[PDB]
Ligand binder design. Structure first.
Ligand SMILES: *[C@@H]1O[C@H](CO)[C@@H](O[C@@H]2O[C@H](CO)[C@@H](O)[C@H](O)[C@H]2NC(C)=O)[C@H](O)[C@H]1NC(C)=O
Ligand SMILES: *[C@@H]1O[C@H](CO)[C@@H](O)[C@H](O)[C@H]1NC(C)=O
Lengths: 497, 497
């Protein structure tokens, strides 16, 4: 059905404008007959996940580039794709009119949209809030007698979360992360700055802080919301930097280890929420594999940890092999998950670049790397922001896939939206990455996965200006003959029986 | 931080086993928000000052005994709690390896322990010594030229006291008492038995005895230890009984009165230790009020007496009102202080009974009675003894809160120890006893006090076998709903503001 309404703000590409009565959308999903493939296409010239279809050849002649499926090379299973429901996202979303809201939520969550199946939920306030608060601000309330969710949860995040689950077809998983504990638990008595939990693991402070996870899970359950997972802390490495500007709680990897084994693990275990998974680290790539070595080589800690959450700041480099690769090699059965990614945080960049194709490519380039290095899921940061990249109470603005202009009851889906979508719409939970080898050096980024039902998906990104002819060989069925346009992203889907 | 390792020895309760690398201990104190109380419980079944918390609510759901705090009804202020560093006690402590020694001292003195702030130091030898001696055994040395401290003081008592002071949570006060003088001052030329100072007050025997107090004080000051008080004599009435087998020095109350007036008072006052307080009596409670009347109705004596020290022999009965009550009534500006308590002389009982609960109850009961009869401090006898209840050069008659087992480098903390701790750990110097009103006749023993900073502490002892439902009201906070289990002791603490 409805095509993209393009508009340009002077960047390398266009945004798709949506409002109360209109938004681009897909027809209900279809599978091509055996012997044919589907192609979805997004180009910098302005194509937006366009659907075409072509035949699979029995034979192939040539000297051009060949990508070969290796359906026997089985690698990680995929958890999913999605984003974060911050105070800022919720607040921009709910500022729109109600039909525009429905369409924004449809874009992300519906099958007419891009099929997100993960939502990350901050436990209380972070920098993408308009104010600082915890769930237990009453001083010294060790018993958590005055614990409670404010309006940010009850009138913004939770109503929106229910609306997303209602709209989605895939089961959605929710992931929680705290930025700061209440201040009376912290060495410096502030939400920001350098400090950690007072005393040491096993004690009253650390036990209270774990009880607070449970009170959080209890509160959300009273609103009929269950979590798949919690992280042990958002960016623990931050609470160790003096003058750190926004909400935080610092743990050395040793402190995180000890916290997990003495308090958080056991407390989660002895409760009605014991099925909730715990992920550690929830920090940048370069903290790996050191942090994993420290936490996972202690079996009292390890037994509690399901997986490792990593952040991906797209404007910064990190060698994937020395970080994810090595971590996987050391701990093959502890899943790697990407719990937050963003762009536009470097000191010299604009937060928001409406229509930026460059930033689209940065997302997809980096998601393919993730999958080539064992990552099982990928979560975006803010689901929506304003044209400043906000609100943010320390003015720490960044870009977002959807940009909301309240004065116009309008939102803009950016290249990032569709670059994410090329993954999230076509790699349901359960899919398994498999091998794919190239027949010669080339400029493409490609990944191949197999769906739970047996059928195939390949994503292809071209970061060169040049058109690249290529053929994908699947020995079950034959050859896909196609072209990858310069600065383009394609997803390919086909049946194998 | 670390829990009690239980061992039973066939009595009604357990002891806590501590050795060179393990001892049960506490976290630093952590004060909960207004409207929350802390509770420490110990039970005969095996709980040992376990911490729990709960609410002070605004509605009253109980229908039983009500105990209402009357914070504006003020009584005595507390000097503190502690025990005696006898030769015996030091021999036992030093029997352990140094790491175990530190655990022993921390148990008593430290914040991670029960926070003693009083140590009684015998002047020379008593029955808990391994030989008889005084600081001046060279005969006819009236100018006390050969006065000096033996190894017992320089190598055992003193270094341990330094070590306790270093560990202590609070400023510690030292109290000294003499058992016997050099026998060349005595009517009987013997360390024990019926015999007092030769001659009469004013003469050279009495002057020399008085100067011995100053020489003692001088010697300990060279080791950088100052005293808070000294008693006029330990158990003066003992020396009047024929055949008294332990070191003694007999004084009739008339003789104590004149000794203070003519000799001990003026000598102390003319000296560099004029600030040391002098306490009279230092003997059993049935000598009161009569001893007070004799000494304190004479003004030449009363001006040097700062308080009356009493002993508690826990195996024996003694009405508090006719003794302590009546004493306070006749001399209400003269502090009462318990300077020695012990239990276990019953010819038919084991001197040390490892894990005896009845014996702890005896300690707490007597402490509560004490506080309710104006007593401002409480000092236990031997800090530590071996398992036969020694070393004692006469005979082993009494228990101690800690029992050292040298051959296993381990020590045992008795119920006694926890029963004292219920008081000592939570009532700092400066605390003041306040009203606590029972709504109806009951089986509990309770006392209430107010910390220097205004917060509340209440101790509640259940000597019966039946559980008692209990409400405690603080007019400025609300109602504390609780149960006092059979054979238990609780201490409650809260903010009032
Ligand atoms: C929301 O945007 C839609 C889509 O652009 C707008 O509808 C278009 O508006 C122009 C001007 O009226 C027309 O010439 C197009 O034909 C319209 N297309 C369709 C499919 O309706 C619409 O006006 C916007 N709504 C608001 C309130 O601005
Ligand atoms: C805590 O909660 C209770 C009950 O909801 C309320 O009456 C009380 O005022 C609260 N206390 C504070 C300090 O906010």
């Amino acid at each position: 059905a409805r095509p993209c309404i393009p508009k340009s703000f002077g960047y390398s590409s266009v945004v798709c404008v949506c409002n109360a009565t209109y938004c681009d959308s897909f027809d209900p999903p279809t599978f091509p007959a055996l012997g044919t493939f589907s192609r979805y296409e997004s180009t910098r010239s302005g194509r937006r996940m366009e659907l075409s279809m072509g035949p699979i050849q029995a034979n192939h002649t040539g000297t051009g580039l060949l990508l070969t499926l290796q359906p026997e090379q089985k690698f990680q299973k995929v958890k999913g794709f999605g984003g974060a429901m911050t105070d800022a996202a919720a607040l921009n979303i709910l500022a729109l009119s109600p039909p525009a809201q429905n369409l924004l939520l449809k874009s992300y969550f519906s099958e007419e949209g891009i099929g997100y199946n993960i939502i990350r939920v901050p436990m209380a306030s972070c920098d993408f809030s308009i104010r600082t608060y915890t769930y237990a601000d009453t001083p010294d309330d060790f018993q958590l007698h005055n614990f409670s969710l404010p309006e940010e949860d009850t009138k913004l995040k939770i109503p929106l979360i229910h609306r997303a689950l209602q709209l989605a077809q895939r089961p959605v998983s929710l992931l929680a992360s705290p930025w700061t504990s209440p201040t009376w638990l912290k060495t410096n008595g502030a939400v920001n700055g350098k400090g950690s939990l007072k005393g040491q693991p096993g004690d009253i402070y650390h036990q209270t802080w774990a009880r607070y996870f449970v009170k959080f899970l209890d509160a959300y359950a009273e609103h009929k919301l269950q979590f798949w997972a919690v992280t042990a802390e958002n960016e623990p490495s931050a609470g160790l930097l003096s003058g750190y500007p926004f909400q935080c709680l610092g743990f050395t990897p040793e402190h995180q280890r000890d916290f997990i084994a003495r308090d958080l693990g056991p407390t989660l275990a002895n409760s009605t929420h014991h099925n909730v998974r715990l992920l550690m680290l929830d920090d940048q790539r370069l903290l790996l594999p050191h942090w994993a070595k420290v936490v996972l080589t202690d079996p009292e800690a390890a037994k509690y940890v399901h997986g490792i959450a990593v952040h991906w700041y797209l404007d910064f480099l990190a060698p994937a092999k020395a970080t994810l690769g090595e971590t996987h090699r050391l701990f093959p059965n502890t899943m790697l998950f990407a719990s937050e990614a963003c762009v536009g945080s470097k000191f010299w960049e604009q937060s928001v670049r409406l229509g930026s194709w460059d930033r689209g490519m940065q997302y997809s380039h980096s998601i393919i790397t993730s999958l080539l290095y064992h990552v099982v899921g990928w979560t975006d940061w803010n689901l929506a922001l304003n044209p400043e990249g906000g609100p943010n109470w320390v003015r720490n603005f960044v870009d977002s896939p959807i940009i909301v202009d309240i004065t116009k009851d309008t939102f803009y889906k950016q290249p990032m939206f569709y670059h994410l979508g090329h993954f999230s719409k076509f790699i349901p939970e359960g899919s398994q990455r498999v091998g794919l080898v190239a027949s010669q050096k080339n400029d493409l980024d490609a990944v191949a996965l197999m769906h739970p039902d047996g059928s195939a998906v390949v994503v292809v990104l071209n970061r060169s200006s040049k058109d690249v002819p290529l053929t994908i060989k699947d020995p079950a069925v034959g050859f896909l003959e196609t072209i990858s346009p310069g600065y383009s992203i394609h997803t390919y889907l086909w049946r194998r029986q």
